[PDB]
Nucleic acid binder design. Structure first.
Ligand SMILES: [Zn+2]
Lengths: 119, 126, 207, 19, 87
RNA sequence: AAACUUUCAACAACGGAUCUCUUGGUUCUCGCAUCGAUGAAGAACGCAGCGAAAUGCGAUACGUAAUGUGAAUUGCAGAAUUCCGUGAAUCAUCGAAUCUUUGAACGCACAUUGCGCCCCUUGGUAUUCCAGGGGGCAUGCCUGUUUGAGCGUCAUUU
RNA sequence: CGUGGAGGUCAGUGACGAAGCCUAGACCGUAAGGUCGGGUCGAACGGCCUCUAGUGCAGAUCUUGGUGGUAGUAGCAAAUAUUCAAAUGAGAACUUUGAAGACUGAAGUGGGGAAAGGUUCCACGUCAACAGCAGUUGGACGUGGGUUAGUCGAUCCUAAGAGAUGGGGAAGCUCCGUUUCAAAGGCCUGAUUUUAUGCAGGCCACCAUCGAAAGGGAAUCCGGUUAAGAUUCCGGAACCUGG
RNA sequence: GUCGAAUUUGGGUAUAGGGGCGAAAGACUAAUCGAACCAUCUAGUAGCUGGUUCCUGCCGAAGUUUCCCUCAGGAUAGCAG
RNA sequence: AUAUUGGCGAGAGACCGAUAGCGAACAAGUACAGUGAUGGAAAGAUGAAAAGAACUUUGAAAAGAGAGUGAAAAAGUACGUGAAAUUGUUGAAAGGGAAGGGCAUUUGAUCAGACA
RNA sequence: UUGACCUCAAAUCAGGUAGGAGUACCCGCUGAACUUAAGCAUAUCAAUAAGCGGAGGAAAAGAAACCAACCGGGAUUGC
């Protein structure tokens, strides 16, 4: 069988924690029956169900802390867009598009004109 | 002839892309042509083979025999029919591997996705 | 590879060991140790005179002499003494050179392009192709040279309106413009007498 | 199969006296 | 007596396992590894040992993070997720 | 005359040449710019119903989530509702996570799975002792904050 | 003349058998070689006109791989020595048991450890390979089992020495130096009853750390127990440290 | 031969290649020492040694001149195609 | 505009075809050697499909002999084709301290040609 | 006494940044010898290999204290 990720996201924080304990209890019993039977493929379903609950549990707490740091500077570093080491050190679009006040007048007064040569 | 710069005509690249193809891309490679009556009924020529399909053998030493597909064994690019087998000297029966290109589908296993695939390929779905 | 055969630290044992004084692989415990290296006669070594990329590949040809042979190859498409001896099946055709109407150049479909070649007597030469397709004798088969076939007619036009695409899929048939007139197609294999079908517009532009 | 034995040259005949 | 009697006295160890490489090249008395240079910050490498660099260059190991770097660049380093499609 | 020796042929041995194949190498051309203290490259140890290695992964361990594809995987065994469906798969894709011990490796050390300190919390009748759990404590340098030092030095008090 | 590959041609040959290989079988050429028959074989190959080269071997104490004569030859002779019966087994000079004869003679061929090895330890099953004879046996092969500590060691201390920091050198990798030209710290607390550890005095200037399983060092003994473990387990009787 | 010491020896530690160490032999420094080992420059150079792969046809030598730190080599003239 | 034996993604060859081509077409920087720096291999092919030989018999067993599978066991996990050195069996011939060769013929074996 | 100024410190102070890898190509430092000169020392190999520091997708260079002597050219780079 196995649990479904979409069925777990509709549960509260305590329901997921209580379900994780039951899956851990269920895994313990199968590890006792495993040593007395030639094969036990059922143990894979229980182990991957635990990974599903732990993923949803970690996703809910990460989403909750992402909302209390929302719309403010200095968000924690694992909730930040890594994307590269070097690209993080690169200038932002605002900083890279900065021009001095003197050259701003030259671009306004003398733009690159559009023209063609036939007549 | 080849006209695009992305298509490759190299022999060892085509063979490597065939033998090392993943399971999803081997479904398209294991395609069987439809029968004459189904081609007129549906309007399409070939479809990927599926498990619960009724098939006809038209080539090989087992030409003429027909049955229901038992398993689509993608790993060796073969397919197994339930009623064409080989009788071993000890009595045990072993399925015979067949290729879908040498087979002819006589009845299609329709569901929600095969109907959508038929309509996507210009089918009419009588 | 420039490093092929030289990726080892083989040193000569010298004389006095009752072995050849050619450098041998050092160390021990692997089997490769003590074996010869760095020689053209040694297993795993470098060959004599390794092939280099700066070998001359393209050959410079005088422009006037290049046009000299091209003009001689167009004159090879004259009376069928050279054409018959070049392998083309042109015995039952009206005349050489063959001059057809310009309406070939505006043909779009291959089927009607093929039928126009059958009417002008090229029926026999097209069946020389599609029957001589033979598997290559050499090792080039798995070097993207698997199949070998004979050469068919050369259709020459003045301006293209679809004849190139219509005859593209026909085996053995090449299309060319009067501007180019490739010598590689007019005398393939250094053999004069290619069977060439001219259009009316191409023939007058040839002058 | 053990590794190949290392080459083992000979005891190099006893030296004649050198004047 | 420099041959087989002398080899019987070999029971110490000049080199032990190195933490950084595990190749058993960590000199006990010198407290340094003769293979990777540990505990020096830079990894030991030399251009005359071109075969030695090939044994420990990038790609010879698991490549736990650089494996997925090219895939993330090809998509322009996206953030978020694909919402959903039909069928 | 046999045996023996030698030559040749047949068949059988020894051995793996030749021929025929090639998911490899090599060379050339074209396009692109993307490692790391937000923990890299590398290393160690582990993870599968039955695995040693390669490959993959990290106590969520030959994977989890998400998306696509739409019925497998396969050596055996297995599970069966997962089969006109939020769904089979050692699939593809991949934007969310996990990511042991290490390593520029960063509490101090390291031929030790050694020894601490701080904060919160739980247990043992405990602010101090012991233990469990969670989070921290490296260096150089820049900007700012706070606390200072120097008859370096200025002004002003009784 | 011959070889690998390339352009052209012979609408060349071929699963009714291509290439290769064997053939005191045949034919042609002065020769380099070419061709045919037969056998074997199973998937491609050739003639001719030109192009191209990593193009022809008996030697180089050639390279790699394989195989001979020598040759069933040299040899399997140090460490005093084995014998009888039974059992097991297809098979016993070599296994097991009993009996007899001997040796190591306690500076041992005994009982334990250190360095080192890493499962060789123990049980069951096996005898293709290994044990330079043999093998039913094995440190072999296959499948499993086994190492239990407040008191034994590591951990801690320092020795010869090693080596950061502050600094000074060196283009630099890095070198000098170890209390060194340094503003190099935490210790007993007492005040607080807003609250947790601010501030009040006095002290001490030692100034990283690493470095011994034979040095230094807090503390356990006896009996019993396993196929293989014990000063560690069980039973009894103790001791130390911290609180 | 020596056998209570200028003794023997384990572990730890220090000295590294034109350096170490040496009651001194050019000894020892991982079977390597009148300059260790490893990799690279390096396919180092050699007037010296060895080898240098199919056939047939035609022609067919020289060890002499002069010069060179030239004398086991080259240049030059001669002979030959 | 220029460079590019690295990295990523592609397209190609008058290149090499398993002693070749990168050291590595394979669990290759692997096995293994060295205290260490480093050194560093060998190793591709059954068949279309395991259909990988049920069963009988001899033997302690390995295996053999039948049977059987397959187009082919002259394809049996020592597996495509299976050369030479070398070896066994069978057949033929020769041999008084080598053998082998050249010219010529005898003898034996074997082959060929053409019927105006 | 109090409050500034200057200089120099401290903090697990608030927020950042540097290391390493790769290194085919690029920017510098450092720097040989074999070899050639039929010996050899200048020279040559070579402003190279090895060693070290620092970048990028290119780097570097770059809008003349330039070339010119002309009827004058007009940043740099490459062919
Ligand atoms: Zn190391």
């Amino acid at each position: 069988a196995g649990v479904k990720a979409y069925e777990l996201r509709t549960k509260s924080k305590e329901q997921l924690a209580s379900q994780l304990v039951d899956l851990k209890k269920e895994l313990a019993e199968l590890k006792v029956q495993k040593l007395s039977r030639p094969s036990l493929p059922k143990i894979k379903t229980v182990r991957k169900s635990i990974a599903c609950v732990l993923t949803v549990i970690n996703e809910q707490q990460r989403e909750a802390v992402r909302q209390l740091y929302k719309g403010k500077k200095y968000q924690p570093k694992d909730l930040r867009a890594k994307k590269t080491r070097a690209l993080r050190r690169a200038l932002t679009k605002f900083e890279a598009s900065q021009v001095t006040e003197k050259q701003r007048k030259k671009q306004i007064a003398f733009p690159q004109r559009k023209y063609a040569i036939k007549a | 002839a080849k006209q695009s710069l992305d298509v490759s005509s190299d022999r060892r690249k085509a063979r490597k892309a065939y033998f090392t193809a993943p399971s999803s891309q081997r479904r398209v490679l294991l395609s069987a042509p439809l029968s004459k009556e189904l081609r007129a009924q549906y309007g399409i020529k070939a479809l990927p083979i599926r498990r619960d399909d009724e098939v006809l053998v038209v080539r090989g030493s087992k030409k003429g025999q027909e049955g229901k597909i038992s398993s689509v064994y993608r790993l060796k690019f073969a397919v197994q029919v339930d009623k064409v087998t080989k009788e071993k000297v000890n009595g045990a029966s072993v399925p015979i591997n067949l290729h879908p290109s040498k087979l002819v589908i006589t009845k299609l296993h329709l569901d929600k996705d095969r109907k959508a695939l038929i309509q996507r390929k210009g089918g009419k779905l009588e | 590879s420039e490093k092929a055969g030289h990726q080892t630290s083989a040193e000569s044992w010298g004389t006095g060991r009752a072995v050849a004084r050619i450098p041998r692989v050092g160390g021990g415990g692997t089997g490769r140790s003590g074996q010869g290296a760095f020689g053209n006669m040694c297993r795993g070594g470098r060959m004599f005179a390794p092939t280099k990329t700066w070998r001359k590949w393209n050959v410079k040809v005088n422009h006037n002499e290049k046009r000299y042979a091209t003009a001689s190859a167009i004159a090879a498409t004259a009376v069928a003494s050279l054409v018959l001896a070049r392998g083309h099946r042109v015995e039952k055709i009206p005349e050489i050179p063959l001059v057809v109407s310009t309406d070939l150049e505006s043909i779009q479909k291959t089927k009607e392009a093929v039928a126009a070649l059958k009417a002008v007597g090229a029926h026999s030469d097209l069946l020389k192709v599609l029957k001589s397709k033979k598997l290559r004798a050499g090792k080039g088969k798995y070097r993207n040279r698997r199949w070998t076939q004979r050469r068919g007619p050369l259709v020459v036009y003045a301006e293209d309106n679809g004849i190139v695409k219509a005859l593209r899929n026909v085996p053995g048939v090449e299309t060319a413009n009067v501007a180019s007139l490739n010598l590689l197609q007019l005398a393939p294999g250094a053999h004069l007498g290619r069977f060439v079908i001219w259009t009316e517009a191409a023939f007058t532009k040839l002058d | 199969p053990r590794p190949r034995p290392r080459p083992r040259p000979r005891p190099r005949p006893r030296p004649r006296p050198r004047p | 007596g420099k041959g087989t009697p002398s080899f019987g006295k070999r029971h110490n160890k000049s080199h032990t396992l190195c933490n950084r490489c595990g190749r058993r090249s960590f000199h006990v008395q010198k407290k340094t590894c003769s293979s990777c240079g540990y505990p020096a910050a830079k990894t030991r490498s030399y251009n005359w040992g071109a075969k030695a660099k090939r044994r420990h260059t990038t790609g010879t190991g698991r490549m736990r993070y650089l494996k997925h770097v090219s895939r993330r660049f090809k998509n322009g380093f996206q953030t978020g997720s694909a919402s959903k499609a039909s069928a």
